[PDB]
Write a protein that binds this ligand. Structure first.
Ligand SMILES: *[C@@H](C)C(=O)c1ccc2c(c1)NC(=O)CO2
Ligand SMILES: [Zn+2]
Length: 140
């Protein structure tokens, strides 16, 4: 699975966070499926600060990056999988595209930087957890 490395922060899907993530916790929110932990090394990624609805995401289950149009971050209902239950998720963006369990954490990027990470899949839709509202990732 994938993550964002910005400053001394590591941004992951909450349900895939490790014990080391939880032991170095900065912030977490179940409703968004996001968790941020602290890092010793500085990261290479820049977070987008924008309202773009077009970008490119990485799909591990295809070994491919795909250009997509996506919705603005919203409170959305997510169906059950073969291996997890159904629930409302907040700050979620949807696009038409392929995702499945191996694709968690793939980056969605726009011309301004990282928009979010792959979070959901079903019925030809990929959902992304937005990070562009988390301005505190840019400092401290
Ligand atoms: C996990 C964070 C993730 O991004 C993901 C994408 C697509 C799908 C799943 C998880 N799980 C499923 O069951 C279906 O597709
Ligand atoms: Zn942008």
């Amino acid at each position: 699975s994938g993550a964002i490395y910005v400053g001394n922060y590591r941004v992951v899907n909450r349900h895939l966070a490790t014990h080391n993530d939880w032991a170095n916790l900065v912030w977490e929110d179940s409703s968004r499926d996001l968790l941020v932990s602290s890092t010793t090394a500085q990261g290479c990624d820049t977070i987008a600060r924008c309202d773009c609805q077009t970008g490119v995401y990485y799909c591990s289950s295809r070994r491919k990056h795909y250009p997509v149009s996506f919705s603005k971050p919203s409170l959305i209902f997510v169906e059950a999988s073969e291996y997890y239950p159904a629930r409302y998720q907040s700050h979620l963006m949807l696009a038409v595209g392929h995702s499945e369990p191996g694709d968690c954490g793939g980056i969605l990027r726009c011309q301004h930087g990282v928009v979010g990470i792959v979070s959901t899949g079903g019925n030809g839709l990929v959902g992304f957890a937005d990070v562009r509202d988390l301005l505190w990732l840019d400092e401290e």
